[PDB]
């Protein structure tokens, strides 16, 4: 059979018997940087910015997974207002990821116009990131204990004005794709996954929900205040690219439904745990009180010690189930930090999902899995 | 927002929707770039009495794992009760 | 709760079946897509006229590191090395010794702007508001060596951007 | 200790004493532990340190312009818990976490004191004692330091 | 309740302790230790010969149904005779629970491949091989996955240096990218951060 | 202030200058040497000594939360002044 | 008692005779368990939970009400789990996990922190 | 009583050829196994409880451009931790490194008495409190 | 500005290196650079490409793309804003405006 | 300024034709904005 | 029981040597195809001597388990060359063409630096 090393951050080694794909062999590592080994020379706070850079489309949801894991080993609890902020920006991050996933999935198969309409919406959401943290993408805003700073005055009004119009933007996206017969032909009955193969291959997220499996960690193993909001979990019927495209488009609508509740049920209070052996004190009280200066000095040089133990903590990240197997030895620096990227198992099933399909279908199947190689390789 | 009436009619008809009510460009409905100073609150631990740290020390209440078995009539059990079935949404069951 | 996305049963009456025959033969839903692109042709584009117009930012923006002074002209930094300890990229290098008048002052303060991840931890750790990230984001160079800042380059930045740096810190220090 | 302060008053401040070119004194940081007093009297044999005053105004020093020069004086830097007594030659040069520790031996005399040599980016920053019950315990002479 | 302390869930601690005993009674041949953490996670520690028996039981039994392999990784501890600790993290959609299964090995003793039980283990085991050097027997396709071709050593071992042993560069004479011993313009600076005062007396070890 | 070496190269506030025969000076040919002209040691020497009427005075650097950690300075010695360890300002007791 | 058009799970076909299929499988499981030693805990537990699921099938002629009793999702899922238990039982005979522990771990194999 | 068949290997456990370390850093290095000495500026003893293994120091020079501290030794920062001395020597032997072992130095018990401060006829009577 | 969104390697005038260059990726980068028809310029975007950034001390990262290919412009930031990369591109335009190829050939 | 324009186009700067002895009629540059105006032009404040 | 361990492939050195020789034959017959596919500038004789040198280094191993691993890595390194997963840079890294010779005698090491 003819063999092609398509290469370049993905190198695909495929053997093709004419038009059919007889085997797909993904060669990865072109973006391996040794993240997990570097985290072992950092304090728990110094390793926080690494997680913004794993799945760089869903930055603030990787912080939350790491923050949930550390807060679990510390045995502390973030304050209620911080949790509501961490859900508000978890759903805003979920709009950022699904626009990128859907529109770059459609741009790789020809439809270039929806990319430009929706990247004007991403630009506006990048201002919400920049107004709270000061950075458009790698905010490092979610931390063990809560969030770094409180929302600036007037941001929630600007989130409301944006959310008020977004549902119309999705509708225009669906006027170009959902019923277009060319789009359906590229995505219907392509990459069919059985509900039993998906579980045994390690799939999670819309890779499960597209095949009819009723599973969403936000509802079954909730974290923060996801059990105080109302939303629906889209479910597929045929387990193909088209059903999975409808699940992400419908999850963008259920995020607007969650955001509308976070804006109305946002409580008052503080935004980081009121324990100054974990979260740094205020600068005003760091410059007047002796204990607050001692604790500021030690938290930013040694860091807080985490009791010995190991934990596996996971969230429903935009691309699936994202978790970390964090191991502590009782010091300020983690011993081992394994990262479970949902796209690592999804891309390992590309060979299975591309059996009996054309070469041009492998493009669609890679798109439907929503692969970002920052997390796959780490 | 400066589109003439005719072009507004043409754009609305082409898309089938009322675009002027949900413009994707921001004009004046946005917050002022200068805002009054805030006064943020303080947490529950900002007290002058009845506030000893040994009564709210989360890290010191963590314990090492408990050993249930170690090599150095009973009714069957499962890790947890079986998960309850999900219910169709009355909001919009079918898309 | 959950909802089905693609579980509809299409009707098989003659009118419905003829509706899908007209759609197949007369390309109705394809021409519905041409109309949407036509509407965008008559919408005002979102492009701004850079470099004469700039994208909005906020007082919390994190740009070019810089070293500040007190209103008297004395340097704020007292060589505590907290920023050097917290920098996740190890982009900061410091050396200090007693000054001629006995003050605790640095003799080296370098930031490698190619190791730096522009994270802001250096300005959170500083107890005296000495090292800050300013609002300047247009400082690209033509060689790699121009991005290795030393204490002279960082003090020049502070004197150069103090008017804007002070106003930003005035606008945000109540949230810190 | 706790993690916050409920102290709402003004703080005490004390004037510094000059006791030679080796030990720098910033006595507002003293916590009146009396380790330096007990060391200078029992280990060193110089009864020049003491407590003057009473109550919250109690101070540690010489009470006169006297220099605590001895072949063992530098050791009060290590036993002082706080930054009240710090090495003057070492002042402001390095922080403890950035130093690499090399466990070596002394050669300034024939006793063979066990020392720790602190380096930092390829430069020797200071010399500290290293416990050895049979040679030097946890003391070194000023010349070795 | 205490606003700053994570609440305890004693119900889930009693249910996971019952199931841990339940598993150890059914596989005495393999289970060496079962422990439940203070934040309600269950760990089954097994002899390395029981990787296939124990995992198959947990996937297929009617009261376990751990049908999803959340993750599989290794941890390196140089002070043990068997350095490498292999960790399986599993999920159960039927009972909405998670469980952790751990075994051990060393540089030279192989472990049985889990691909027959979980097709998800195919790539995870290559990653453990590539980064730790643990050989998995009967693997359909075992080879480096993350490191560069021709890479020597296993970078996640605790004794492998952070910056490696060689670095790449373009040489104009030979018109290709070459590998050379690593010299750093600025050496990585090592900070000794640990405080000399005990932090947690609950975890103190016997002297 | 900035004073130039015999070879014409300026001296920084830390005292740095390349000797005459140091090859490293070639980096400045067709270029310049970045030197900050505002020597902090000179600027803080121009500030007047503040007269106070108490044994102990407090300094926070000015601006409240925008200054430096608040420290208390003892003014019992008339031979010298009280100097702030953070900002370098000086304080003196009024004739007692 | 109307038959369902789809199970909702891709690759899982509807079964027209759920009651007959389950009785066969459960009986087959109980017959395979007879070859396992009497005292082995796997036999005692699996018989305990197989019989009560077999008694629920033989006392509930309605499929929808049977699923509520079994609590295993679709009746096709309960059939699939029976086939997995049957395969597991056939494998426990060859493994014999009821024997004593093969080997003890080294002295400090499970100590943490080191 | 394992089911798998076992073989006999009566040889020294040596892995120098499969760890991938260049021979330059196996034969010319000298590991040092020791218990870190207590930092003399503090009274804490919590950093003197585990055995460490470090390698021998090598050249550090100055970067011509900035003045940073350059190095060519890939083992300059490598530190390993061990629960006991026997486990540290085991790791060095199988990796082929030459090592020196220094016995743990534990402070000897001391005889303390607050009443000795006020002795009637002995030399331990202090003169100040 | 005239800067097309996407161009093939053989129809392109500038290479923008945006991300971390690993040791497994470096040979592919040099190959693409050698096949670019001249004149050709390289823009280094971000801390990773400039000097390695957050992964500088990693075993699998090339410390700066400028030791694999020549670089004309360095754009700092992690990541640089989209308005900071645009400023760098317009700074490459002015650099090309200062070229004097013909005025140096005429004086040979 | 022109507040009828949509946010982002409501403030612009027409650069000088000469700055620090450099001819900037054609060679404009975004770093020619001094810090005091750099804050107003980027909408970090409403006060010129 | 301490010396009783599980094997990888070979139960004794005699079976291990069989795998070593089969691997050597595989490498010996591939050099002409490698020197041709990658358009190397070395000769086939130089290629076949490098294989000989690599095998010679590990000729003092007496542990069958260790020998099995060396063969496993050799077969992995071989599959990369046959299938052209490597590139010309990777193949030529066995030769060190851009590294200046480093002296082996005491005096030369004394003149240049401090390393032994
Ligand atoms: C054939 C299509 C008809 C062409 C005529 C276009 C026209 O008159 O549109 C008017 C009017 C303006 O369009 P719009 O959608 O409302 O948006 C502009 C704003 O209303 C109002 O926007 P504005 O306030 O910014 O308008 C100011 C604008 C002045 O507005 C115009 O220039 C529009 C007239 C252009 C003709 O000033 C300019 O920028 C002048 C630049 C002129 C460049 C284009 C020159 C085209 C001439 C033909 C090429 C010859 C070579 O559109 C119509 O009514 C079309 C109906 C007739 C068809
Ligand atoms: C032909 C080229 C266009 C020439 C200009 C046509 C006349 C322009 C005009 O003013 O009327 C256009 C008309 C808009 O009227 P309409 O949108 O229906 O009313 C909204 C009131 N706010 O639009 C129309 O409805 C007319 C077409 C029907
Ligand atoms: C003609 C318009 C009237 C009509 O179509 O019949 C309507 C009639 C009522 O509708 P309904 O109840 O759904 O019946 C269909 C159930 N089999 O539905 C009928 O039952 C009518 C008879 C059904 C069979 C007619 C099949 C029509 C398609 C034949 C091909 C027509 C090709 C025309 C040329 C196409 C190119 C323009
Ligand atoms: S922004 Fe972050 S990475 Fe950059 S110098 Fe400051 S602390 Fe270091
Ligand atoms: S934290 Fe601030 S005062 Fe301390 S060394 Fe850094 S810049 Fe100077
Ligand atoms: S040893 Fe230090 S803290 Fe103790 S009394 Fe002497 S100066 Fe004060
Ligand atoms: S380091 Fe210690 S002695 Fe120095 S000021 Fe802080 S608490 Fe006081
Ligand atoms: S955003 Fe930062 S971490 Fe990510 S590739 Fe760019 S420079 Fe590297
Ligand atoms: K001291
Ligand atoms: Zn001051």
mmCIF file of C-alpha atoms in Angstrom, chain I residues 12-94:
data_model
loop_
_atom_site.group_PDB
_atom_site.id
_atom_site.type_symbol
_atom_site.label_atom_id
_atom_site.label_comp_id
_atom_site.label_asym_id
_atom_site.label_seq_id
_atom_site.Cartn_x
_atom_site.Cartn_y
_atom_site.Cartn_z
ATOM 1 C CA UNK I 12 6.086 32.899 1.208
ATOM 2 C CA UNK I 13 8.438 35.736 2.123
ATOM 3 C CA UNK I 14 8.469 35.577 5.946
ATOM 4 C CA UNK I 15 8.409 32.721 8.466
ATOM 5 C CA UNK I 16 6.727 33.407 11.817
ATOM 6 C CA UNK I 17 7.830 30.985 14.534
ATOM 7 C CA UNK I 18 4.981 31.045 17.062
ATOM 8 C CA UNK I 19 5.400 28.519 19.850
ATOM 9 C CA UNK I 20 7.924 26.240 21.498
ATOM 10 C CA UNK I 21 10.549 24.681 19.236
ATOM 11 C CA UNK I 22 11.349 21.196 20.524
ATOM 12 C CA UNK I 23 14.337 19.014 19.688
ATOM 13 C CA UNK I 24 12.057 16.633 17.772
ATOM 14 C CA UNK I 25 10.810 19.574 15.663
ATOM 15 C CA UNK I 26 14.008 21.500 14.886
ATOM 16 C CA UNK I 27 15.087 19.565 11.747
ATOM 17 C CA UNK I 28 11.658 20.116 10.195
ATOM 18 C CA UNK I 29 11.967 23.858 10.824
ATOM 19 C CA UNK I 30 15.379 24.163 9.165
ATOM 20 C CA UNK I 31 14.159 22.178 6.158
ATOM 21 C CA UNK I 32 11.226 24.546 5.620
ATOM 22 C CA UNK I 33 13.531 27.556 5.971
ATOM 23 C CA UNK I 34 16.030 26.238 3.411
ATOM 24 C CA UNK I 35 13.217 25.725 0.880
ATOM 25 C CA UNK I 36 11.827 29.265 1.170
ATOM 26 C CA UNK I 37 12.647 31.254 -1.994
ATOM 27 C CA UNK I 38 14.631 34.393 -1.290
ATOM 28 C CA UNK I 39 14.397 37.078 -0.026
ATOM 29 C CA UNK I 40 13.231 35.476 3.238
ATOM 30 C CA UNK I 41 12.839 36.838 6.764
ATOM 31 C CA UNK I 42 12.131 35.134 10.091
ATOM 32 C CA UNK I 43 10.040 36.668 12.879
ATOM 33 C CA UNK I 44 10.458 35.106 16.323
ATOM 34 C CA UNK I 45 7.211 35.401 18.285
ATOM 35 C CA UNK I 46 6.966 34.820 22.016
ATOM 36 C CA UNK I 47 9.294 33.888 24.847
ATOM 37 C CA UNK I 48 9.463 30.219 23.821
ATOM 38 C CA UNK I 49 10.838 30.992 20.369
ATOM 39 C CA UNK I 50 13.019 33.913 21.475
ATOM 40 C CA UNK I 51 14.929 32.094 24.210
ATOM 41 C CA UNK I 52 12.932 29.083 25.413
ATOM 42 C CA UNK I 53 10.812 30.969 27.932
ATOM 43 C CA UNK I 54 9.092 28.844 30.548
ATOM 44 C CA UNK I 55 10.786 25.675 29.220
ATOM 45 C CA UNK I 56 14.286 27.141 28.894
ATOM 46 C CA UNK I 57 15.811 24.549 31.247
ATOM 47 C CA UNK I 58 14.065 21.563 29.652
ATOM 48 C CA UNK I 59 15.872 18.629 28.055
ATOM 49 C CA UNK I 60 13.605 18.594 24.977
ATOM 50 C CA UNK I 61 13.411 22.308 24.073
ATOM 51 C CA UNK I 62 15.730 24.280 21.800
ATOM 52 C CA UNK I 63 16.753 27.393 23.749
ATOM 53 C CA UNK I 64 15.696 29.934 21.156
ATOM 54 C CA UNK I 65 14.905 29.454 17.479
ATOM 55 C CA UNK I 66 17.788 31.784 16.567
ATOM 56 C CA UNK I 67 20.310 28.958 17.039
ATOM 57 C CA UNK I 68 18.500 26.952 14.342
ATOM 58 C CA UNK I 69 17.707 29.726 11.827
ATOM 59 C CA UNK I 70 18.579 33.415 11.506
ATOM 60 C CA UNK I 71 16.057 35.811 13.031
ATOM 61 C CA UNK I 72 15.181 39.347 11.911
ATOM 62 C CA UNK I 73 12.636 40.463 14.545
ATOM 63 C CA UNK I 74 11.970 39.322 18.118
ATOM 64 C CA UNK I 75 8.458 39.887 19.488
ATOM 65 C CA UNK I 76 8.407 39.524 23.302
ATOM 66 C CA UNK I 77 5.530 38.473 25.515
ATOM 67 C CA UNK I 78 3.975 35.174 26.626
ATOM 68 C CA UNK I 79 2.051 35.420 24.375
ATOM 69 C CA UNK I 80 2.513 38.788 22.682
ATOM 70 C CA UNK I 81 -0.788 40.531 22.152
ATOM 71 C CA UNK I 82 -2.213 40.427 18.648
ATOM 72 C CA UNK I 83 -1.456 44.161 18.560
ATOM 73 C CA UNK I 84 2.153 43.452 19.604
ATOM 74 C CA UNK I 85 2.784 40.943 16.819
ATOM 75 C CA UNK I 86 1.238 43.428 14.386
ATOM 76 C CA UNK I 87 3.652 46.077 15.667
ATOM 77 C CA UNK I 88 6.496 43.649 15.000
ATOM 78 C CA UNK I 89 5.307 42.976 11.451
ATOM 79 C CA UNK I 90 5.155 46.711 10.735
ATOM 80 C CA UNK I 91 8.667 46.945 12.201
ATOM 81 C CA UNK I 92 9.831 44.349 9.672
ATOM 82 C CA UNK I 93 8.271 46.456 6.911
ATOM 83 C CA UNK I 94 10.334 49.480 7.936
#
